[PDB]
């Protein structure tokens, strides 16, 4: 048979992405598949004046 | 606020390997053209 209704309320949650906030303006993001390729981990800048 | 929203990319950038391409037709005409172009970018806009 049929019975009484039930009062339920589900919250709504806003989900975040890194590329979708303004914080990604300061950074420059690239995709590096494995960080184990970068073993030396040192970068040399050659500045000309 | 001015213009109310900023336009940007949608997925992380990837790296391109475009260092070498010269395996095709080493010849005098393209040689002259390349020298002219890469020297003319200095002055011209």
């Amino acid at each position: 048979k049929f019975e009484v209704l039930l009062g339920v309320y589900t919250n709504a949650i806003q989900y975040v992405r890194f590329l979708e906030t303004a914080l990604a303006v300061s950074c420059v993001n690239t995709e590096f598949k494995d960080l184990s390729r970068m073993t030396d981990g040192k970068i040399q800048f050659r500045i000309s004046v | 606020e001015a213009d109310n929203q900023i336009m940007g990319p949608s997925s992380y950038a990837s790296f391109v390997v475009r260092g070498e391409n010269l395996v095709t037709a080493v010849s005098y005409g393209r040689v002259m053209r390349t020298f002219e172009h890469f020297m003319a970018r200095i002055v011209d806009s």
Partner: peptide, 22 residues
């Protein structure tokens, strides 16, 4: 830092070969 080798080619970020990229 790996003195004795050859430089083969370059990966690029930002699609511009200028000094601005890494």
């Amino acid at each position: 830092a790996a003195e004795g080798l050859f430089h083969s080619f370059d990966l690029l970020v930002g699609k511009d070969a200028r000094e601005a990229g890494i």
